[PDB]
Amino acid sequence: PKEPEQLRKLFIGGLSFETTDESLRSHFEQWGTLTDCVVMRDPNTKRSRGFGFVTYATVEEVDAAMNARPHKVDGRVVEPKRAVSREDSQRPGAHLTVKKIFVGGIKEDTEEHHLRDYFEQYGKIEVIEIMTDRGSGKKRGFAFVTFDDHDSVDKIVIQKYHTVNGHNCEVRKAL
Ligand SMILES: CCC(=O)Nc1nc(C)cs1
Numbered sequence: 001p002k003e004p005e006q007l008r009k010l011f012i013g014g015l016s017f018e019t020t021d022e023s024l025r026s027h028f029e030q031w032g033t034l035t036d037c038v039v040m041r042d043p044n045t046k047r048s049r050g051f052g053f054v055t056y057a058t059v060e061e062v063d064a065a066m067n068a069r070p071h072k073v074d075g076r077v078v079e080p081k082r083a084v085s086r087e088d089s090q091r092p093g094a095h096l097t098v099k100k101i102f103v104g105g106i107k108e109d110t111e112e113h114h115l116r117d118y119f120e121q122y123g124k125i126e127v128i129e130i131m132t133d134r135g136s137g138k139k140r141g142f143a144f145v146t147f148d149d150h151d152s153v154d155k156i157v158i159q160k161y162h163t164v165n166g167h168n169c170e171v172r173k174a175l
Contacts (some may be wrong), residue, residue: 006083007158008035008056010065011095013079015039017048027073028054032061066151081154088157088173096173099126100146101153103162104170106130108139114165119145123152144174 012024025037036055041048056062062082070077081095090096103115112128119125127146132139147153153173156162162169 002057003059005035005055007059008062009083010054010056010062010080011051011083012054012071012073013051013081014076015048015050015052015078016074016076017050019048019052019074019076021052023074024052024054027071028065031056031065031068033057063155069151082151082158084154084157084173097150098153098173098175099148099150100144100174101156102142102144102170102172102174103164104142104172105167106143106164106169107141107167110139110143110165110167115143115145118162118164119147119152119156122156123147123149 010028015024019039021037021039024039025034028034028037033056034054035057037052039048039052054065056065065071066080066082069080071080072078081097084095086092088096106115110130112130115128115130116125124147125145126148127144129144130139131142131144156171157173159171162171
């Protein structure tokens with residue numbers, strides 16, 4: 001019944017070196033129950049590595065925290081990011097932080113408003129590009145959507161399914 005823990009974590013980059021497990025928790029508990037919260041430190045010096053992780057009890061709590069950005073934690077604006085699968089990563093353990101998606105499988109009957117009406121609930125859209133053939137102008141059956149922020153893309157690509165205009169679509173991070 002609980003969402004997988006991986007989908008409930010936020011990496012928090014850019015921490016003040018004075019941020020502690022306790023102060024990171026106090027801050028992020030404003031948006032949900034935290035089942036875990038840790039500042040990464042050097043194993044010998046105990047000096048902060050400048051990043052940490054928080055784990056919420058639910059995905060809706062992750063969303064609430066992301067919607068409350070920018071977060072100023074102990075005087076410094078931090079960089080929260082949610083996890084995505086390796087298929088949308090540039091190397092194991094690394095986050096491909098992009099604002100654009102490829103949307104495939106939309107065929108020739110899908111229009112800009114279909115993509116806008118669906119994707120606007122993931123984030124603020126800046127560009128919709130329905131791809132057409134360079135020679136004929138016919139729709140090629142794929143599109144790109146650019147958002148104002150990467151978390152929209154991260155939420156999108158972790159869904160198993162996207163149904164747009166009745167088509168089951170393939171969605172991936174782009175560039
Ligand atoms: C530095 C690597 C990185 O960004 N790690 C991330 N972990 C999660 C959980 C999201 S991004």
